[PDB]
Design a binder for this molecule. Structure first.
Ligand SMILES: O=C(N[C@@H](Cc1ccc(O)cc1)C(=O)O)c1cc(-c2ccccc2)c(=O)n2c1sc1ccc(OC3CCCCC3)cc12
Ligand SMILES: [Zn+2]
Ligand SMILES: [Zn+2]
Length: 576
């Protein structure tokens, strides 16, 4: 309470109207403080019309239901988030500590930690929105930020709360996120987890490059390629991991260390969380041993903790760590350090890690059964008995990573592409969703265009998607700019948010600026841009071959014209 008490007192005093201690609260692993009272999805008509066959598809239908109400916020909360991860064994705790140290040193070999700024935060906020904008322009916002910073320098914290008249707390939230960005932003802003700096990371590489990266790993001699899912990663982050993560502060300057120390000790290793629940109230809870997913640095810190954990699993697999070692309070460091120094970077290059998502090609398949450390650390795998060996892949094109798998294509001119793919229903289902309500047909059309153009660059190889994309582009006016973002994914670089010729953009991404494309001959026509094989298009969810799809394909200009006539008397272009 000596840390969180000051934040507890302010929310108490602010909402003392309806403040109380409800003894029928469902919080067993979280510490509960109090509560107070406070106040399906919409469909993209343009995309829907132009994808009629997928009206009668379960996965598309399922994606047309969002559970953003407080009913759903508690539904999945207690299952994973209200649980305790047992403390790792002394040996495991030492190994992690050594590895973390070694890893932090390796990452900061060239780069240097530094504070991010008001100007950077401002620049990002503006470009993103293209309400927080209003707060950034407000000078009194930044004055409040300074106030809290002085508290943070003093080791205290007053207003930094986390969420799972209104502008007051809205400023407090945004201000709290800036202070994080200030202290820990550099990890993201200076690209510490770029593949060049991290070896295993893929920050700033982009979806289009991920397939090429995995193919490169497959060339590395060793065992199979393992991509194990962790059950609720952010919930499995221990107190120990947080102690390992903060070791980064050792490379910071005094004034920067100072601020980062506060962020770690006061908002990560302790956290006062707001969570909404029907009875409609807001419960105030706190704990020390999990990740605040909405916070800044999360991706960076997950990537780090995962990199470490996999190196440790690799060590176990290689027979460096035994059961006895993990149990040992007085485990010797020599063999670990030796391993890290001689083989560490090599073993990092065998991995592609983005947050809790990982792919690993160990030197052999002992890794598959090396599960002592992995389970002991807390990173228990999803939907598989704790001690059952992992299922690896012998073809990199089967390996799942960042919600995708990847295909190697052969173009008509002999050159080879490597493209991202996933079930066609997931892509179409997502496209048919529009965000929120009160959207005009123009705004609805431009989102459809955004999605249509994303498919042109990333999923062009899917026959149905290319057809649907050309249909949407035909039905939507030419000079209308794609507005709202198609995804929040960190791997999306948003090359489709443009009114430039998509074949020109395609050429830029896949030929021109593609390090793996040696011959830079321009592809002059979409006829030269390849698809997957028919059978693999079908295996990944295509409806090519079905009558209904042939009907849809045959009757598509009629539907385009209907959308055109409802949009109005504008300038359209045909892409059929
Ligand atoms: O406030 C948020 N939601 C808004 C805004 C937003 C902004 C940025 C972002 O991406 C995602 C969402 C929305 O959904 O539109 C939000 C949500 C989430 C979130 C996502 C999945 C699960 C739980 C939380 C979220 O992750 N975030 C927000 S605002 C926000 C700001 C920065 C941020 O940094 C990332 C990248 C750099 C390293 C640290 C992590 C993350 C972040
Ligand atoms: Zn604070
Ligand atoms: Zn596929």
């Amino acid at each position: 309470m000596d840390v969180i008490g000051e934040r507890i007192k302010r929310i108490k005093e602010e909402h003392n109207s309806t403040w109380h201690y409800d003894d029928e609260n469902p919080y067993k692993t979280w510490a509960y403080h109090g509560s107070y009272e406070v106040k399906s999805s919409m469909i993209n008509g343009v995309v829907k019309l132009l994808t009629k066959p997928w009206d009668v598809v379960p996965m598309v239908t399922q994606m047309a239901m969002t559970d953003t109400t407080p009913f759903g916020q508690q539904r999945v909360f207690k299952e994973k988030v209200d649980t305790r991860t047992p403390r790792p064994l002394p040996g495991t705790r030492k190994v992690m500590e050594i590895t973390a140290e070694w890893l932090w040193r390796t990452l900061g070999r060239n780069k240097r930690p530094r504070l991010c700024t008001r100007e950077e935060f401002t620049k990002k906020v503006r470009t993103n929105a293209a309400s927080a904008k209003a707060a950034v322009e407000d000078e009194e916002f930044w004055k409040l930020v300074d106030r809290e910073r002085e508290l943070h320098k003093l080791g205290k914290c007053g207003s930094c709360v986390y969420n799972m008249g209104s502008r007051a707390i809205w400023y407090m939230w945004l201000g709290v996120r800036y202070l994080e960005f200030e202290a820990l932003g550099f990890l993201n802003e200076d690209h510490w987890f770029s593949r060049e700096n991290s070896y295993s990371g893929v920050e700033g590489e982009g979806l289009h490059k991920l397939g090429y990266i995995l193919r490169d790993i497959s060339k590395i001699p060793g065992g199979a390629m393992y991509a194990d899912d962790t059950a609720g990663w952010d919930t499995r982050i221990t107190e120990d991991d947080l102690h390992n993560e903060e070791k980064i502060i050792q490379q910071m300057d005094p004034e920067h260390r100072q601020l980062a120390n506060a962020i770690f000790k006061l908002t990560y290793q302790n956290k006062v969380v707001k969570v909404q629940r029907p009875t409609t109230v807001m419960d105030i809870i706190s704990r020390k041993d999990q990740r605040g997913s909405g916070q800044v640095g999360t991706y960076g810190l997950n990537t780090f903790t995962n990199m470490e954990a996999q190196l440790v699993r690799q060590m176990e697999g290689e027979g460096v760590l035994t059961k006895a070692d993990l149990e040992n309070p007085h485990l010797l460091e020599k063999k670990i350090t030796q391993w890290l120094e001689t083989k560490g970077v090599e073993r990092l290059k065998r991995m592609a890690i983005s947050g809790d998502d990982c792919v690993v090609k160990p030197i052999d398949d002992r890794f598959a059964n090396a599960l002592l450390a992995l389970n002991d650390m807390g990173k228990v795998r999803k939907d598989i008995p704790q001690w059952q060996p992992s299922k690896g892949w012998h073809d990199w094109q089967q390996v799942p990573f960042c919600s995708h798998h990847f295909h190697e294509l052969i173009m008509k001119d002999g050159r080879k592409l490597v493209v991202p793919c996933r079930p066609q229903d997931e892509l179409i289902g997502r496209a048919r969703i529009s965000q929120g309500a009160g959207w005009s047909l123009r705004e609805t059309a431009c989102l459809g265009k955004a999605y249509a153009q994303m498919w042109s660059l990333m999923y062009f190889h899917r026959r149905d998607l290319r057809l649907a994309s050309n249909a949407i582009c035909s039905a939507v006016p030419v000079h209308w700019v794609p507005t709202s973002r198609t995804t929040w994914s960190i791997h999306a670089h948003h090359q489709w948010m443009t009114t430039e010729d998509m074949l020109t953009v395609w050429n830029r991404v896949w030929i021109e600026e593609n390090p793996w494309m040696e011959d830079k001959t321009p592809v002059t026509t979409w006829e030269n841009v390849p698809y997957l094989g028919k059978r693999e298009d079908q295996w990944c969810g295509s409806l090519i071959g079905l009558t209904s799809r042939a009907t849809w394909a045959q009757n598509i200009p009629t539907a385009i014209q209907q959308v055109r006539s409802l949009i109005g008397n504008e300038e359209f272009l045909d892409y059929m």
